[PDB]
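ligand=2-acetamido-2-deoxy-beta-D-glucopyranose
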Amino acid sequence: QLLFNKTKSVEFTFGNDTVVIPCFVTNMEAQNTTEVYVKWKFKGRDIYTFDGALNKSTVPTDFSSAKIEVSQLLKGDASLKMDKSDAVSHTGNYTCEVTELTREGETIIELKYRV
Amino acid sequence: QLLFNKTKSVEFTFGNDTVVIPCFVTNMEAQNTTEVYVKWKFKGRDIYTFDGALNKSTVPTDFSSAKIEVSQLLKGDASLKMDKSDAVSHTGNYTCEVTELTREGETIIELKYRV
Ligand SMILES: *[C@@H]1O[C@H](CO)[C@@H](O)[C@H](O)[C@H]1NC(C)=O
Ligand SMILES: *[C@@H]1O[C@H](CO)[C@@H](O)[C@H](O)[C@H]1NC(C)=O
Ligand SMILES: *[C@@H]1O[C@H](CO)[C@@H](O)[C@H](O)[C@H]1NC(C)=O
Ligand SMILES: *[C@@H]1O[C@H](CO)[C@@H](O)[C@H](O)[C@H]1NC(C)=O
Ligand SMILES: *[C@@H]1O[C@H](CO)[C@@H](O)[C@H](O)[C@H]1NC(C)=O
Ligand SMILES: *[C@@H]1O[C@H](CO)[C@@H](O)[C@H](O)[C@H]1NC(C)=O
Ligand SMILES: [Mg+2]
């Protein structure tokens, strides 16, 4: 149910020292990163994950420069940054997946009848 | 992770034509009731549920009058209202359970290189 400001593609040349792959959720609700999860995929593997429960990011060695700016996630910006080496060696189709996890709670009230 | 403005118990007398059992979530995030689920339990059974995704409420016949005001739910007010006849036969501990459903989405961007 999260909605995106979509972009078909972006382009870089040998002049780019670094690249940004845009990803913007337009209907974020999370007030804290604790229930946000972000996954970037490339050719069907996870090349970046942010686990908001842990406030930690995991990257594979072949995408060692991949990062998001966690300070922007609550605005719905999940944009992927990386160095040109990683960009050049991984041109093609990227998937940006964002999740806001379930939240629940309960409370107990006793209903009393007085006479 | 949902938090409540709690009340240990609420009293009613013969004068109450209807009864209100308070339930107030203090940290709601949902912007649409389609994402919210409410379950009121009494003695180990579900005596009222609202499935926000379906915009539908279910009650057992022994709580036929039981309801919430859906218009108040995004404020975190999941308070249960019933007739005195349904209340007087069912004194004791009520549990109010509120859930804000997970939300996910994905988008694809091609990173293209230009010579
Ligand atoms: C590469 O650099 C140009 C020059 O500013 C910029 O417009 C473009 O967005 C960059 N490409 C990417 C994919 O970051
Ligand atoms: C990326 O996806 C598009 C279709 O969405 C496809 O036409 C294109 O060939 C893909 N790019 C690569 C490098 O496979
Ligand atoms: C019963 O009525 C009184 C006064 O009208 C009110 O203060 C009280 O909250 C009511 N009790 C319930 C359980 O609704
Ligand atoms: C809430 O979300 C649903 C699903 O997108 C939509 O149909 C509905 O119009 C929205 N607004 C209200 C007031 O229910
Ligand atoms: C659920 O019912 C309410 C009636 O107050 C309506 O406003 C809302 O649009 C309905 N939810 C939908 C269509 O998702
Ligand atoms: C409701 O719960 C409390 C637990 O704090 C318990 O002391 C009490 O006996 C329960 N009331 C009824 C009517 O079973
Ligand atoms: Mg949520």
